[PDB]
């Protein structure tokens, strides 16, 4: 269930930043979130599992399910069907901003 707590019921927007500050980002920074745990490089052609929202490479995920475990390599949950895999364009849209 998605019941909203008292806080969530009355929470306000978190105002965004128009100021034009700049953040510094190394290939190491945020790496825990951007690395395909298959190939440990940058996500290219991202895929996401619909049951658990886990991202992998399109070219990489085909081989991990090919080696006989049919679960999600991250949370170890049975990956049902084939429609559980969708390419993630809104996520690759994000990679293209961070070449290193």
């Amino acid at each position: 269930t998605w019941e909203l707590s008292l806080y969530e019921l009355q929470r306000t927007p978190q105002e965004a930043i128009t100021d034009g500050l700049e953040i510094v980002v190394s290939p190491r920074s945020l790496h825990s979130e951007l690395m395909c745990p298959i190939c440990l490089d940058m996500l290219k052609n991202t895929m996401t599992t619909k049951e658990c929202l886990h991202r992998f490479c399109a070219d990489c995920i085909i081989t991990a399910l090919r080696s006989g475990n049919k679960e999600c390599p991250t949370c170890r949950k049975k990956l049902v069907s084939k429609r559980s895999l969708r390419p993630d364009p809104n996520f690759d849209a994000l990679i293209s901003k961070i070449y290193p």
């Binding site: 929470r11 978190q14 100021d19 945020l30 979130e33 996520f91 994000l94 961070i98």
Partner: protein
Amino acid sequence: TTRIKITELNPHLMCVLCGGYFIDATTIIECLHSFCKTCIVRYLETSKYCPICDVQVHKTRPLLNIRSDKTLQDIVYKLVPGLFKNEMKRRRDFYAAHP
């Protein structure tokens, strides 16, 4: 390593209902669109279709096909300086006034 103007990322880090950054980021597992947890729950109280792409989330129970996106929410808390401080402090303040 590069430096990026945050005005360049704000599209990828903002809820179209809230006009602000994602807090408790949540994702429709059909179209991979994402909104604040509270924003989309209130939205889906009146529509079974995505606010942006306009797909049908479900014929009957829309909440069935949305998941937390902690992977996405973590990217926000890391790129946006002190957003996590600010949001956590907001919640303490609340429960300091409502026990």
